[PDB]
Design a protein around this ligand. Sequence first.
Ligand code: MGK
Ligand code: ZN
Length: 955
Amino acid sequence: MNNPAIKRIGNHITKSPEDKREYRGLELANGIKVLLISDPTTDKSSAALDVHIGSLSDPPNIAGLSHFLQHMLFLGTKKYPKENEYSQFLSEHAGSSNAFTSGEHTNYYFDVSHEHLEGALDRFAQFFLSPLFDESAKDREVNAVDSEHEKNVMNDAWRLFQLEKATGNPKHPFSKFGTGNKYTLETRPNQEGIDVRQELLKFHSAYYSSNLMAVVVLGRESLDDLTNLVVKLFSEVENKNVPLPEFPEHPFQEEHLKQLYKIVPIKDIRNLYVTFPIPDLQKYYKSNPGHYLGHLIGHEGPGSLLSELKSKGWVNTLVGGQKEGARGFMFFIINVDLTEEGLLHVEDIILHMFQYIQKLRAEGPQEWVFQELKDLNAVAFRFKDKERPRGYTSKIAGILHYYPLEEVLTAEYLLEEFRPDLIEMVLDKLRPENVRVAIVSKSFEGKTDRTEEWYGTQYKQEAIPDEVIKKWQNADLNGKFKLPTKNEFIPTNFEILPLEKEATPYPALIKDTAMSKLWFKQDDKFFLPKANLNFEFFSPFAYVDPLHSNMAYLYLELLKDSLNEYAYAAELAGLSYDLQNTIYGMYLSVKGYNDKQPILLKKIIEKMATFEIDEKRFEIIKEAYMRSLNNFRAEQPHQHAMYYLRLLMTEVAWTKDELKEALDDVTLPRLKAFIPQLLSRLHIEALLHGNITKQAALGIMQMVEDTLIEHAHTKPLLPSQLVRYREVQLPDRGWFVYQQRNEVHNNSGIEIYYQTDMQSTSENMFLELFAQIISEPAFNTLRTKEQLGYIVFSGPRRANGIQGLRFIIQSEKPPHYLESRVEAFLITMEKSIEDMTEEAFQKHIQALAIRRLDKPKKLSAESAKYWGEIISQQYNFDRDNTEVAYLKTLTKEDIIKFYKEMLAVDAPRRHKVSVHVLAREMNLSQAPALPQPEVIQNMTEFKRGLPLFPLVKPH
Ligand SMILES: COC(=O)[C@H](Cc1cnc[nH]1)NC(=O)CN(CCCc1ccccc1)CC(=O)O
Ligand SMILES: [Zn+2]
């Protein structure tokens, strides 16, 4: 009978009957709520802690302190004081880890090889026991946070996110600045005599209290074993009985309602944000009146708000529903993007909104809708895919805070109560008398008179004219607006087909004709009534030239726009498709309950092959596409770096500027012509994978072919015109640099590529092992020590059959300098591989092996792996055992000599390309001295003047 350390252990966690995992919920004596998960099949174990404090509890005079504290627990505790003990332990044991801070939560998660849960968890527990907050770490780390913020400065979501806070009640914690930067966490604290290390110590001690913590742990250990484990490591987290913060008063009071904000964006975008304050609905989780109204106002089917708004050519996409706030307040929003016509009809757009809200009011609550929503969720739950442990633990850790233990798994899914009163009550708040309207549009350049402090956002504020409100308050009924009708796409066949006699472990090539290559595998693994049906359509006309590339794109976009109304049912019913053009021709994937899949597929291909373009729709989509082309000049420096490198190293690739130019010559006549052309010769390669039989799959494939032949007279592509593109072949010992300026962002970016060779069993493992070995040392050096920026990445680069090592960094320092430090770092690595024990070397092999061998948890994960073998024409489905068997063979001498051949600064076959992206305005290890780079003036000339690699041979 009773353990002193456990307050209780009832009862029985409700899981899906499909869910093979075992679960124990429990509460420690110190008040920590805890879920244990035993899965004796798992390859990685995982754990997570969530503390119910976050940025909303920041001291007013030190903004971002809790985000900063989160950064700091990683950098040393009393029991494991090495600045990077934690993260290195993880790396050498196939783990990874992150954290985040919302306004009420700080959330910490890791995964490790199943065999080392305990070692991981023990280091992990110390974050919550005796963090060091080293003076020297704090000094460095504040920069990583300053970077985390700069990254966000010029991004439109983050600016709008803060603007909202800065326009509500300034006295309210909602208005606080979450991220924090260097100014708020080092400069102004010094100016005001604060010792931040103390302030972190004070804050950790004040709020990281056990009564405010929830833990989840997933491992192969029995439930009893996990219990002992958790109790051991966590019983000594101290209970300081902290009252859990509430915010009963809304940040939007009367003076904050009936306001119009006109806002200048960074990207050339136009949207309208409509938003009403609502009470906190969390406690209504079993009826969920917010979701009901969301499902409705947000509907995109026939008769919906969105589809009238879009027929009138005013908006294109809509999102509506309940938005989080914190304990005590929430929002209900309706946000749309805007056409040019739309921008001019904002007053009208909102009337339409209120006419629809009025309709809902007119019909009253609807139990049949509730019933649909509830059934949909029952089914979602019953067959939810197995989640990756890290996500799972992190997520549940969050919600242990809201639901009884027994309910944690089901609470966010199952609906129980039908609540016409709550439905009605929330609806009563969606009124013009407490509306907020915000317009984001470049047309406010200069017309602005305010500036948001933290992001610099410029905008104007205004009371909506008393007599615009009145006009909205009288919103009539409007007969273009109907409730949605029954969802016909809801599945009702869930039968798992039995496993065939000749069924196989990997996909089989079951059809090899000139028209198509069908790869097929019945699911032997997850047994859910779902499937994935993937297709590459090859046509050389998709990417023959910039003009065509645009056409391929627009066609597909107008097609998706056209099916949208009908497709949406299917999406709600757990059946979705994804359709986009590639450099190779087109891609189509259909995932979800297999029951009604063949209906949706058929509808897609048919529409595709008999497509009839609305002209108004074309003109709007095109104008939007133009903007998204420009809008690249506002993506981030490192994305630019990455993007130029892709352009520089692929045989064929059209630039954003080329596409922009060629976009003007795209006319209705021209597109109409293009489509039948595209569809007239194709090849199809497909993976059909899931709850389906060989006969079913063969049929599905042929139905696709048949529909095309029938409506597009499609016929086969010639084997020889199955063009796959090559990577540029860099000379032995060369170094080229390409330079560009980012105009928006005041940071710089850099990608450095050391190209090694073709992919091959041996060549792959040489690069992979080296990547694993440097993986954390790189992060720990270039970011944690050197603090070059927030974004510091290294790893293998694999494109068009060739490979290499890359570094990507976004910094404040110039690329000339970034370059220098990577090279410095690179020598440190030859050194430390020389110095490391055979056993340290073997651990790395074992860590790679484990990452490589980790088994898929869900159908779409397994599909992805195969689809990679297929899209890359390597067709090596057994690559993981092969490549791993070979890895174990490798010795230290092999890696030293691999590095010396291909990577060292004076490597006989070093092949280096750097992309330098300059910012809007432009004691340490020893950097080696570098050659004069060759500066690339012209991308085409560069490509013309080098060899191209071969392409890989298949299995
Ligand atoms: C259940 O209700 C729905 O289906 C709607 C409506 C909709 C989706 N697509 C067409 N309409 N879908 C929603 O996602 C509504 N809403 C999203 C607001 C969160 C948010 C967060 C950050 C920045 C902006 C906004 C809640 C949700 O996730 O379900
Ligand atoms: Zn952070």
